[PDB]
Every structure is written in structure tokens, then in C-alpha cells.
Structure 1
Amino acid sequence: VRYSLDPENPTKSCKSRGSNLRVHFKNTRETAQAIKGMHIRKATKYLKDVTLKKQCVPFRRYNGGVGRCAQAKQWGWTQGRWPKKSAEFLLHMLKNAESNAELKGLDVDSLVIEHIQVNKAPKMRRRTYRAHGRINPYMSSPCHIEMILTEKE
């Protein structure tokens, strides 16, 4: 559909997009910035280390009350975290994006992601029960993820 950014060369570029994915927006954006510049096979290896708590995701913007860890010093930061569902949903997406590149006849082992964008999806409606017979909202925070890879030696 109407992507947010046009690639500099559509022949050497492939796209992927995920809409209304039930995953937290704040954890998705933080791992979207750390995944932006690396190579695709470097991208997949880094995401598996997040699941196994070997490499952390540096929380930069949405970091109020986030605990700090020793693995954030590799990113020049203090606060780190290892989101599982956040890395898992965008692990299938490069798998989806890898399939789009081979269908287009692009070289897999030299793809470099340049653009990745996380947008807020419409919030689901649940509720919680509080004191004195009060009901408070229980807003879910899904988000839209779309990225574009490009061939580069």
C-alpha cells in the first residue's frame, strides 16, 4: 500500500509490512531503532540473542522506570531490556521480507535495512475493576510495523 518512505531504487529494494500486530508499541519502537542500521543476517542473529538474553535492547525514549543492565554498555547506554514478543513478531517479518527479496531476484546475503517505522495501531478495549465499584480502562497497545530493505555491497 502507501508506504511512508519511497526507496531510492525500487529495483534493488524489497518491502514488508505488518498491520494490527498485538505487541507493545513502546518495546517495538526501542528495538526498531537498534535494528535499523545492521545487516540482515546480523539482524537475525541479534534478534535471537535478545530472546536468549545474550544481547539487550537499549531503551532510549520510553525508559521511565526501566531497569539498567550490564549489556547496555555496548550501545553506549545504561538501561537495557530483552523484549521477547517484540523481537519475535519482527523476526518473522524479515523472514517475510527475505521471501520477498528472493521472489524479486535480489541477493539475500547483502541486504541492508535502511528504513523501519512503528506506528500506533487502534487500541483494543478491555477493563479492570477497582475500589468502590469503579471500572478503569485496560487499553491494549498494538502497533503497525513496516520496513524496506535494499541491496548494497
Structure 2
Amino acid sequence: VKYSTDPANPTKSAKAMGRDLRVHFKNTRETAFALRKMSLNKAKRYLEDVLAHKQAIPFRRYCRGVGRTAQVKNRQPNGQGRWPAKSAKFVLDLLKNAESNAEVKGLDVDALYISHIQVNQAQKQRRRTYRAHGRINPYMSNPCHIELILSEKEE
């Protein structure tokens, strides 16, 4: 529909979005944050490496509890980061969808880079769990909206 941002050059832009996707908002937010400004070819390989547990995603805002590793040392010195598998797959779906959108229009696929990636919270879905002494507590999910725009790099 409308994204938070207008493409800087709309003629050389392709865009993809997905709403109400059952993946964790917090992990998906960190995945997107670490992808911003990347060229597409690096974006696809970076995410695939996380899936194969070869590269990591730094966690910065939502990090209280996350373990430490050597892989994320280059970007986050405190070593704190994970490999959100489900988040990476969902973004790869939309990254490939936006890539397909560009080939329809005619953009230079190897000149594309992620111009804008945004994650927003969706309507939470409700389940419930059972606690001691005959009590019920909510057991809810945190689905997200994702929108991205690839833009041809200009000199």
C-alpha cells in the first residue's frame, strides 16, 4: 500500500512487503537492522550464512539474555549475537520477491541494494498456558509486518 518512505528514485526501485507474519518481532527487527544499506548479492549470501550458522546477526536493543560468540566480533565487539533462522528465511522470501519485481520492470539486478527495510508489530495472537494453583496466563505471539525497497545504486 504505502510504505514509510518514498523511493529516492522511484523508477529504479522494486519493493516487497508482507503483513501479519508469524515470526518473532524482536529477532526479525535485529535481522533487518543488520541488513540495511547492503547490496543485494551480499544480503542474500549474508542471510544464507546465518541459516548455515556461518555468520551471525548482532543483537543490540533486544539483547538482555543473548549469549556471546566469536562470529559477530567484527561488527559488535561485545560478541553478543544469534542466528535467527526463521527470521532470515522470511526476509529471504521477500528479498527474492522484490528481486523478481525488479526483473519485471527491468532494473539491473546486480546494481540493486536494500534502500529501506522496516519491521512493525502486528496484531498479537492469543494462546494460553496453565500455572500452579488453577490459574491461567496468556501465551501470546508477536507477529510482525515487514516492508523493503531495493533501489538501483547511482554514481
Q: TM-score range by the shorter chain?
A: over 0.9
Could you tell me which residue of structure 2 aligns to residue 50 of structure 1? 50
Equivalents in 2 of 1:137, 1:68: separation in Å? Answer: 30
| SS across alignment from 1:145 | strand
Q: Structure 1 counterpart of 2:150, which letter?
A: L
Q: CA deviation at 1:128?
A: 0.3
**1-structure distance, mates of 2:54, 2:5:** 33
Q: CA deviation at 1:8?
A: 1.2
- The number of residue pairs the alignment matches comes to 153
More displaced 10-residue stretch of structure 1: 44-53 or 67-76: 67-76
Tell me the residue number matched to 2:70.
70
Q: CA deviation at 1:25?
A: 0.3
Question: 1:76, CA displacement in angstroms?
Answer: 3.0
Following TM superposition, by how much is the alpha carbon of 1:2 offset from its aligned partner in structure 2, in angstroms?
1.3
**CA displacement at 1:127 relative to structure 2:** 0.3
Instruction: Give me the whole-angstrom Cα distance separating, in 2, the residues matched to 1:2 and 1:45.
Output: 29
For residues 71-90 of structure 1, what are the structure 2 equivalents within 5 Å?
A: 71-77=71-77, 78-90=79-91
Runs of 4+ in 1 over 4 A off after TM superposition: none
Matches within 5 A, 1:4-153: 4-77=4-77, 78-153=79-154
- Computed over aligned residues only, the root mean square deviation of the Cα atoms, in angstroms, reads 0.8
Distance 1:58 1:17 in 2: 23
Distance 1:76 1:145 in 2: 24
Point out where structure 1 has 5 or more consecutive residues left out of the alignment: none
- 2 CA distance for matches of 1:86 and 1:143? 10
Deviation of 1:49 after TM superposition, in Å, equals 0.4
Superposed CA offset, 1:117-148 (max 9, x none): 00001000100000000000011011000011
Q: Secondary structure at the match of 1:148?
A: strand
The two structures have a TM-score, normalised by structure 1, of: 0.97
CA deviation map 1:36-56 (0-9, x unaligned): 121101100000100111100
Per-residue CA deviation, residues 22-42 of structure 1 (Å, 9 max, x unaligned), is 000000000111111211011
Aligned equivalents of 2:51 and 2:140: distance in 1? 26
Task: Please tell me the residue identity of whatever aligns with 1:85.
Answer: K
| Residue 114 (structure 1) shift | 1.8
Matched letter for residue 52 of structure 1: A
